[PDB]
């Protein structure tokens, strides 16, 4: 995409959870499932503002522990988010360390979701004992999503992905370069 981001609607990606959602780097969080996404598919980096992920929302599918492979299930429910935040390149190199010139994780996946435990989204997808997994996403219409945007909690704040078409598209636009 514009700035040399990687945005494709649908993808393999690993995912983690995560603590703390409230003021995430799209500017405003949302009362349903929400998500962070790794930099290079978010669109922006750390303080620039939002990038084009942000208020889109994608069905997620766990279906392998890679820390427990011989582990055959069960694991969670299909869910979907809404991307508001940031995994950014720095400070999460194992899941969210994907660039322009190395495309994967540590763990091959091209895309990474880090979903917000606050709000309910984690519980519903990662079995106990089983928080890392990989598999799949799609983006859907944000009419499969349920939940409240909160405010802008600064000029420029941005959930507008929220009523995109899926990509390619572009709804709050990309900031600057992607990570090389
Ligand atoms: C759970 C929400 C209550 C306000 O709608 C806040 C989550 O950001
Ligand atoms: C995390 C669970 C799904 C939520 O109902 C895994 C099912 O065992
Ligand atoms: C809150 C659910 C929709 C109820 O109709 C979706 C999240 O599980
Ligand atoms: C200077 C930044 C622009 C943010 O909109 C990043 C340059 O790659």
Redesign the pocket.
């Known amino acids: 995409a514009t700035g040399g981001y990687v945005q494709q609607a649908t993808g393999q990606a690993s995912f983690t959870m995560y603590s703390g959602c409230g003021s995430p780097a799209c500017g405003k969080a949302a009362s349903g499932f929400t998500a962070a996404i790794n930099q290079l598919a978010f669109g922006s980096?750390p303080g620039?503002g939002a990038g084009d992920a942000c208020g889109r929302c994608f069905a997620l599918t766990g279906n392998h522990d890679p820390y427990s492979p011989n582990y055959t299930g069960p694991f969670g429910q299909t869910i979907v988010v809404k991307v508001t935040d940031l995994c950014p390149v720095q400070g999460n190199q194992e899941f969210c360390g994907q660039t322009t010139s190395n495309p994967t994780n540590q763990h091959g996946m091209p895309f990474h979701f880090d979903i917000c435990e606050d709000t309910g989204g984690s519980a519903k997808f990662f079995p106990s004992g089983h928080g890392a997994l990989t598999g799949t996403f799609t983006e859907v219409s944000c009419s499969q999503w349920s939940g409240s945007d909160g405010g802008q909690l600064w000029n420029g704040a941005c959930l507008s992905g929220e009523t995109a078409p899926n990509w390619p598209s572009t709804a709050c636009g990309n900031?600057?370069?992607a990570p090389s």
């Open positions: 980096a620039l900031k600057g370069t």
